[PDB]
């Protein structure tokens, strides 16, 4: 309907081509909200799925925790950690900003 | 149709039947091929999801560049958009070990 | 044929399975191996109308 | 959708046939594969 | 969209754990392809007949 | 090379829910494998430490192997299944002090009586 | 083969032993796997079954 009343955007437009050229795009298996129904549960999953031997228990730990444990787990003394936890977050949420 | 008799005719709307069923198997073709890559690349992701999301990765190169922390995943238009966070070392110095 | 364009060697390519062999690679030299060659063609013996 | 023009499609086999069932059949790999990726991303246990 | 057992954080030096107490086994099956079934054509009889 | 021949640590990449063990039989156009995983139910919740100090003795501190510290007062529990046992020396390891540790001054477990 | 350290050397163990130590190394304790064989044989059967 919306290339009948309202026509193509632009030129060579693939979509308004559908209902011509006689051919149809198909909606993809899931929504939206679907897809971020399962991103998002993934996101809380992170801190207590990563964390120790078997994947059939969940510790619900804090974020930041988990990430010291990921910290010390490669090399970075647990001394270093308590010291500069904030310094750590900071260089964090400066790489994701 | 409305300029040729048939004899003549035929031969006309046989170089647009010949012309068009090329490319309708040049496009078959290259779904087929796309989808393939699509779905290995699927595999992919999966194994992403589960070493680097779901888990730290030990594995050099991997997930991200340096040495893996935490992964977050978002739905991205065809795909996962991952997002690595690693940690990088700096201002190396020498010691006698 | 030769430098001086003279003919030399040849294969008839319908003597048997292995001449095909080397015409369809147009070669003398082919490698080792298990090759796909024409079928052994059925002959008409009569006709019947 | 010219008649004159489906008769002579039509010694070209069941062309459109087979275009409609390659298609198909890659787009339900597609959904398998959505199907599958999405079973596994899937958390077992989660925080809100 | 199915989701997962909630699981909560404390606001503590403590934390929840979520632990089966119980257990099954399942069997996961897969098919992995390492084949196709190997062809050869005449061609020359294919198209000439 | 990693599902039959060993037991699989990579989450997804055998079957589902946690790998025990693989057979392979051949089928028509390849190779069908059976994957058996651990699949656990019933989840219950429960309270857990990050691990444990002697409150003293401060810097002596342990923290579980492959499983949890559990209230119950404390004790330990296997990482996949809900059976809680004594801590002991055999499922603990000692390691440097915390601030989510809790501090125990009564019933220590053994690894804590200095 | 997917018991120790190593693919050199090979351990001719019990299927039943091997799966035991399988079962220890994923979280669940020998405490409770000595308790349980048979339960566990029992399961084991039913998801092959
Ligand atoms: C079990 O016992 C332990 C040991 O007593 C206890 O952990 C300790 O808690 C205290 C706080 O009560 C920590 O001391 C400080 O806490 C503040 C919090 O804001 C930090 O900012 C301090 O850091 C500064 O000072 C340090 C030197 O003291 C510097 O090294 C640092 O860079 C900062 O300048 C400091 O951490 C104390 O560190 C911890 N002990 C350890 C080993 O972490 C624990 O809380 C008890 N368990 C429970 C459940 O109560
Ligand atoms: C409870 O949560 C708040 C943040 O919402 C935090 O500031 C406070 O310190 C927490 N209390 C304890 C005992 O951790
Ligand atoms: C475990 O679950 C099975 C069903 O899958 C049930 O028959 C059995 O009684 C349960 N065992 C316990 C201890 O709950």
Same mark, same amino acid.
Request: proline content about 5%.
């Given at each position: 309907?919306?290339?009948?009343?309202?026509?193509?955007?632009?030129?060579?437009?693939?979509?308004?081509?559908?209902?011509?050229?006689?051919?149809?795009?198909?909606?993809?298996?899931?929504?939206?909200?679907?897809?971020?129904?399962?991103?998002?549960?993934?996101?809380?999953?992170?801190?207590?799925?990563?964390?120790?031997?078997?994947?059939?228990?969940?510790?619900?730990?804090?974020?930041?925790?988990?990430?010291?444990?990921?910290?010390?787990?490669?090399?970075?003394?647990?001394?270093?950690?308590?010291?500069?936890?904030?310094?750590?977050?900071?260089?964090?949420?400066?790489?994701?900003? | 149709?409305?300029?040729?008799?048939?004899?003549?005719?035929?031969?006309?709307?046989?170089?647009?039947?010949?012309?068009?069923?090329?490319?309708?198997?040049?496009?078959?073709?290259?779904?087929?091929?796309?989808?393939?890559?699509?779905?290995?690349?699927?595999?992919?992701?999966?194994?992403?999801?589960?070493?680097?999301?779901?888990?730290?990765?030990?594995?050099?190169?991997?997930?991200?560049?340096?040495?893996?922390?935490?992964?977050?995943?978002?739905?991205?238009?065809?795909?996962?958009?991952?997002?690595?966070?690693?940690?990088?070392?700096?201002?190396?110095?020498?010691?006698?070990? | /044929?030769?430098?001086?364009?003279?003919?030399?060697?040849?294969?008839?390519?319908? /003597?048997?399975?292995?001449?095909?062999?080397?015409?369809?690679?147009?070669? /003398?030299?082919?490698?080792?191996?298990?090759?796909?060659?024409?079928? /052994?063609?059925?002959?008409?013996?009569?006709?019947?109308? | 959708?010219?008649?004159?023009?489906?008769?002579?499609?039509?010694?070209?086999?069941?062309?459109?046939?087979?275009?409609?069932?390659?298609?198909?059949?890659?787009?339900?790999?597609?959904?398998?594969?959505?199907?599958?990726?999405?079973?596994?991303?899937?958390?077992?246990?989660?925080?809100? | 969209?199915?989701?997962?057992?909630?699981?909560?954080?404390?606001?503590?030096?403590?934390?929840?754990?979520?632990?089966?107490?119980?257990?099954?086994?399942?069997?996961? #099956?897969?098919?992995? #392809?390492?084949?196709? #079934?190997?062809?050869?054509?005449?061609?020359?009889?294919?198209?000439?007949? | 090379?990693?599902?039959?021949?060993?037991?699989?640590?990579?989450?997804?990449?055998?079957?589902?829910?946690?790998?025990?063990?693989?057979?392979?039989?051949?089928?028509?156009?390849?190779?069908?494998?059976?994957?058996?995983?651990?699949?656990?139910?019933?989840?219950?919740?429960?309270?857990?430490?990050?691990?444990?100090?002697?409150?003293?003795?401060?810097?002596?501190?342990?923290?579980?192997?492959?499983?949890?510290?559990?209230?119950?007062?404390?004790?330990?529990?296997?990482?996949?299944?809900?059976?809680?046992?004594?801590?002991?020396?055999?499922?603990?390891?000692?390691?440097?002090?915390?601030?989510?540790?809790?501090?125990?001054?009564?019933?220590?477990?053994?690894?804590?009586?200095?």
């Amino acid at each position: 309907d919306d290339c009948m009343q309202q026509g193509p955007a632009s030129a060579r437009d693939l979509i308004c081509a559908q209902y011509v050229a006689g051919y149809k795009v198909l909606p993809p298996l899931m929504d939206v909200n679907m897809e971020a129904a399962y991103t998002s549960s993934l996101l809380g999953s992170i801190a207590g799925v990563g964390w120790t031997a078997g994947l059939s228990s969940f510790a619900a730990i804090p974020f930041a925790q988990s990430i010291f444990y990921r910290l010390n787990g490669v090399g970075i003394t647990q001394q270093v950690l308590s010291e500069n936890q904030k310094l750590i977050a900071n260089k964090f949420n400066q790489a994701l900003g | 149709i409305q300029r040729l008799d048939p004899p003549e005719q035929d031969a006309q709307i046989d170089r647009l039947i010949n012309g068009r069923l090329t490319t309708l198997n040049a496009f078959v073709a290259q779904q087929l091929v796309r989808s393939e890559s699509a779905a290995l690349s699927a595999q992919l992701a999966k194994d992403k999801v589960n070493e680097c999301v779901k888990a730290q990765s030990k594995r050099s190169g991997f997930c991200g560049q340096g040495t893996h922390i935490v992964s977050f995943v978002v739905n991205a238009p065809n795909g996962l958009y991952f997002m690595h966070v690693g940690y990088y070392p700096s201002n190396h110095i020498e010691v006698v070990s | /044929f030769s430098v001086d364009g003279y003919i030399r060697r040849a294969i008839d390519c319908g /003597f048997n399975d292995l001449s095909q062999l080397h015409c369809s690679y147009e070669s /003398f030299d082919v490698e080792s191996g298990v090759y796909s060659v024409s079928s /052994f063609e059925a002959k008409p013996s009569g006709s019947v109308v | 959708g010219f008649q004159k023009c489906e008769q002579l499609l039509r010694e070209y086999g069941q062309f459109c046939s087979k275009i409609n069932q390659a298609l198909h059949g890659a787009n339900l790999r597609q959904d398998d594969s959505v199907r599958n990726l999405f079973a596994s991303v899937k958390s077992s246990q989660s925080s809100p | 969209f199915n989701h997962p057992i909630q699981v909560d954080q404390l606001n503590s030096s403590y934390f929840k754990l979520s632990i089966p107490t119980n257990f099954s086994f399942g069997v996961t #099956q897969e098919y992995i #392809q390492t084949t196709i #079934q190997k062809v050869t054509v005449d061609c020359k009889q294919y198209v000439c007949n | 090379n990693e599902c039959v021949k060993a037991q699989s640590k990579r989450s997804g990449f055998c079957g589902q829910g946690t790998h025990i063990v693989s057979f392979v039989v051949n089928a028509p156009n390849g190779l069908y494998f059976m994957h058996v995983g651990y699949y656990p139910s019933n989840h219950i919740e429960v309270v857990s430490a990050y691990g444990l100090c002697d409150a003293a003795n401060p810097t002596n501190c342990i923290a579980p192997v492959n499983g949890y510290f559990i209230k119950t007062e404390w004790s330990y529990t296997g990482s996949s299944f809900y059976a809680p046992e004594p801590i002991t020396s055999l499922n603990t390891k000692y390691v440097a002090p915390q601030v989510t540790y809790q501090n125990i001054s009564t019933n220590l477990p053994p690894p804590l009586l200095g």
